[PDB]
């Protein structure tokens with residue numbers, strides 16, 4: 091589909107058998123999701139933006155479904171105020187910016 | 190143009206007569222630029238990001254040219270990690286997400 095930017099570009103995603111709302115975010119290098127108890131091994135990481143850094147758990151090779159499109163890659167989990175889908179997954183669903 | 194997301198969507202902008210690099214960011218509601226001198230009145234404002242809140246200078250009705258496309262709108266100036274073009278100006282240049 092084509093998503094205009096009058097409102098936050100929020101979409102439903104499916105991760106770990108759960109449905110969540112996430113922002114399609116071209117400014118996010120990586121995908122960051124609100125705290126959730128994913129199984130598997132993980133590595134600590136810190137990611138920074140406006141206001142400083144937060145501590146997150148980095149999980150690799152996680153499958154996510156974004157509006158029916160399937161994607162698999164690194165997901166960071168942590169105390170983020172919003173779920174963000176980042177470039178690492180947006181590239182996989184064929185997402186582009188057009189103006 | 191159609192911009193893919195394998196690399197950061199960095200573009201040249203023209204603001205206050207000076208060229209700069211900025212990231213097109215569909216997860217940003219607002220446009221936030223690193224510290225710089227901007228002609229005009231401004232009011233103090235706060236904006237919240239992943240890491241908390243920061244103090245910025247809010248400049249209203251600023252002319253900015255983004256890959257040749259003209260926008261006129263609010264620009265926030267403060268300690269952001271990178272210059273970001275937010276939805277308030279992306280909508281002006283007719284930007285959409287497509288996948």
Ligand SMILES: CCOP(=O)(COc1ccc(C[C@H](NC(=O)O[C@H]2CO[C@H]3OCC[C@H]32)[C@H](O)CN(C[C@@H](C)CC)S(=O)(=O)c2ccc3ncsc3c2)cc1)OCC
Nearest residue numbers: 117118119120137138139171216217218219237238239241
């Ligand atoms: C209801 C809202 O609650 P809130 O007010 C704010 O919540 C939020 C709303 C949206 C976003 C997404 C973020 N946008 C943003 O910061 O936009 C601000 C400017 O425009 C305003 O609108 C939105 C907020 C205001 C950017 O898109 C992405 N970022 C990087 C960017 C800043 C360039 C370095 S990233 O998220 O830091 C991030 C993600 C993955 C990653 N991998 C490695 S680094 C790394 C960094 C974050 C928080 O809570 C305050 C405590």
